[PDB]
Structure formats: C-alpha cells, structure tokens
From Swiss-Prot:
Gene source species: Viola odorata (Sweet violet)
Family: Belongs to the cyclotide family. Bracelet subfamily.
Disulphide-bridged cysteine pairs: C2-C17, C7-C22
Domain of life: Eukaryota
Protein name: Cycloviolacin-O1
Highest classification ranks of the organism: Eukaryota, Viridiplantae, Streptophyta, Embryophyta, Tracheophyta
Function: Probably participates in a plant defense mechanism.
Amino acid sequence: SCVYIPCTVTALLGCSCSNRVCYNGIPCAE
C-alpha cells in the first residue's frame, strides 16, 4: 500500500498507486 508514500515495490512494472494500493490493472499488493 501507498498509504502516504508511493508503492516503490511493484510500481516498477506499472503498479499505479490506486487508492493507496499498487495497481497495474490488477493489484500487486503493498
């Protein structure tokens, strides 16, 4: 989750922090 901070864990592949949740069409946890 990107609660306050970005994801910086899955965002690498395109896991866009949607509602403070790494999301790349489908979530990526964190």
